[PDB]
Amino acid sequence: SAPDWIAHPDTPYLLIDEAKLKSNINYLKQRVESLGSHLRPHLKTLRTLEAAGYLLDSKSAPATVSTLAEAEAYAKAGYTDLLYAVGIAPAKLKRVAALRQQGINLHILLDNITQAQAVVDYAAEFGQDFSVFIEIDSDDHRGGIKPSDSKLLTIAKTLGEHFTGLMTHAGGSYACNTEQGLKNFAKQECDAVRIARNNLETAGIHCAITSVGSTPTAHFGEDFSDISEVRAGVYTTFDLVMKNIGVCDFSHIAMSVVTTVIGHNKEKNWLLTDSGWMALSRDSGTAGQNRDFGYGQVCKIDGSVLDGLCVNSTSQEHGVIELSDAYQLEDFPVGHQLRIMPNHACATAAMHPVYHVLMSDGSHNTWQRITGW
Amino acid sequence: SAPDWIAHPDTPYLLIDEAKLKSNINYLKQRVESLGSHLRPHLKTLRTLEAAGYLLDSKSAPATVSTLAEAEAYAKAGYTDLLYAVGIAPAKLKRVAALRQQGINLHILLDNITQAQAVVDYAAEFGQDFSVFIEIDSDDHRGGIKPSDSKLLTIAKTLGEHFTGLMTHAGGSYACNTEQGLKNFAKQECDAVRIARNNLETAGIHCAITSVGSTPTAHFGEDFSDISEVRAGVYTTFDLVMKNIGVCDFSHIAMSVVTTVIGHNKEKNWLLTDSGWMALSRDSGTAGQNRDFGYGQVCKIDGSVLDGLCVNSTSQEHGVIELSDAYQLEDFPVGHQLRIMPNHACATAAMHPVYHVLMSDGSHNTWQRITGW
Numbered sequence A, B: 001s002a003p004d005w006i007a008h009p010d011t012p013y014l015l016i017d018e019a020k021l022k023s024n025i026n027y028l029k030q031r032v033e034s035l036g037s038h039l040r041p042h043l044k045t046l047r048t049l050e051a052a053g054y055l056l057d058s059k060s061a062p063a064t065v066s067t068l069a070e071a072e073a074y075a076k077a078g079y080t081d082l083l084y085a086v087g088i089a090p091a092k093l094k095r096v097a098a099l100r101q102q103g104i105n106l107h108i109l110l111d112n113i114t115q116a117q118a119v120v121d122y123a124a125e126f127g128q129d130f131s132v133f134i135e136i137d138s139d140d141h142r143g144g145i146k147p148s149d150s151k152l153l154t155i156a157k158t159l160g161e162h163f164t165g166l167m168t169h170a171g172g173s174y175a176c177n178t179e180q181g182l183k184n185f186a187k188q189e190c191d192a193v194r195i196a197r198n199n200l201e202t203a204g205i206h207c208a209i210t211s212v213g214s215t216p217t218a219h220f221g222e223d224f225s226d227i228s229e230v231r232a233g234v235y236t237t238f239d240l241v242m243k244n245i246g247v248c249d250f251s252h253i254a255m256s257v258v259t260t261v262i263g264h265n266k267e268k269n270w271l272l273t274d275s276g277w278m279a280l281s282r283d284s285g286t287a288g289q290n291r292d293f294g295y296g297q298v299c300k301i302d303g304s305v306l307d308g309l310c311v312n313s314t315s316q317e318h319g320v321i322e323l324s325d326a327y328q329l330e331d332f333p334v335g336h337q338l339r340i341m342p343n344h345a346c347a348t349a350a351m352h353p354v355y356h357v358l359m360s361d362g363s364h365n366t367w368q369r370i371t372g373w
Ligand SMILES: [Cl-]
Pocket: A001, A002, A003, A301, A302, A303, A358
């Protein structure tokens, strides 16, 4: 039985299970460290100050952020080792410099000569040191330099003392759904940075840090012994996309939207809830996988899965659950409450300015999301 | 040429064109009033205090809201006639009562006997008056009572003095893409409430207010002379879904995301921007229409459409624009800026805590979004 207070806040609202959060976090930390590396957790799934305390051993422990809004918030909270892992816009260099002048080791990411020259020009004009990763393309999906591209050498040389190392994200691993496919994708990700690192060293370039990761590759890679750090973030809570990939099952999913039944359609056997896309997002990641959960798997207020029930459709402020003939409208009266598991934790969390947290001791906490850019 | 200040805020950010906002608003007001009715504008697309000033003639003018967060914010700002147009959860009645005790004519919406009994029971226990609309199903898509359902009579009678009238939203009109189809859908919407109203009056029930509307039906209905009020909201800015339906063309779209080019892929002819789904949302409404704009139509910083260019893919904090062979990467260097028009204005605006506003006099304003529930 969930605590009585789940029924207190008006719906819809986001609910994080602290006990499951902590389990998910402990599992990956122990796994990566047993494989000879360490984590640089990514803060962008949850984007709360509290999440960094669960994920990081100390204020100086390496972390990843997806925005300078995050960087500024975590720096204010005392965190001093932050990789801003999105290709840098030159106009943001003054904000990066401002953090570095406050004692924050704020690293940036780039993959082109224009960005590298902007860093060098800024450094020259303002006397500012930078710490810079070059993005490597490991999965043919996003940015980064291919390991064999001669411009890898040119760009690293241009950066000189500001060059810190190599970073890749194999987000393409999300297409996988077998253990061997995942192991292979993790090896592809690591090999891309190994090859890039070898090409750098052959050319006389020192590479202080090699950095790989996504939740799937972090959970299935077999050898991180020569990789400096592994990054992951969505594993904090998991989601249905992860369930379908096979990184977790339903029991590991620590995020849900608490929703109230606000109507019925007797003719069509529908429940209408207050969980529209404004609460869930329109992420439909599971539609491209082998089990389509619509806009989320429906659960009881105690968290247990209601077989066969999903939020099939949404508008802005309501959702529709098409009941199967195994269910009766009468058992879900207006005012009854449910929990919806998300397709994509990162996308659903973006919709909530404040999260409610079921602490492992049964108590109720709230966390404020760091929003904007 | 757009004002120089568009290049000042860090990207991505949301930009509203005030001159176009004002034009779009003036057009519908004059149209509906010429057809013998008046507007109850919906505030949920923009959810700013400033939007209500553009949309409403006075603080007492009727408006629509989608959340009690909106209701509370607009009430604090002095607005006193607010229809909360989402089927009511019984636990929210105490918040509705609190507003009504402050002098706010806060109307609620319901479609089932459970909700009606909850209102009556609250009224009896706490001595509280309510103003209640019954939702009518006009489009077979969402909630509401069919006009011929005998429970319409039962529910209205149960409400007694709290019964204010009938409300429908023909969101199904969004499937239309011809002028005659839209005219017909508007007639279907109005006829549904006319029939319901006739059934009420035959049974001896007074119906103070009849309320219809969506942006498409408001712009194409031919006869509102016997309908109390017409509701619309997305027309404030329009969007690509509306463009495809044919309610507007590109020139009327008053919302865009300003984004910076942060990378290139030479092999594939890609631009990478800082406009991911965190800035645009994953609404893909145009994919089901006759012109798929991906995650948005790409425009120059001056607002003019770049033919053939869309944000084809997104991740969390970046977007990908696949260039056609009409374009050269060189013309969009890293640091170049673009504007992205949204699929769905309501969905894109949800992603932005603050909007930047290009005032009609060329100046720069900002508006704070009212977030949460
Ligand atoms: Cl629980």
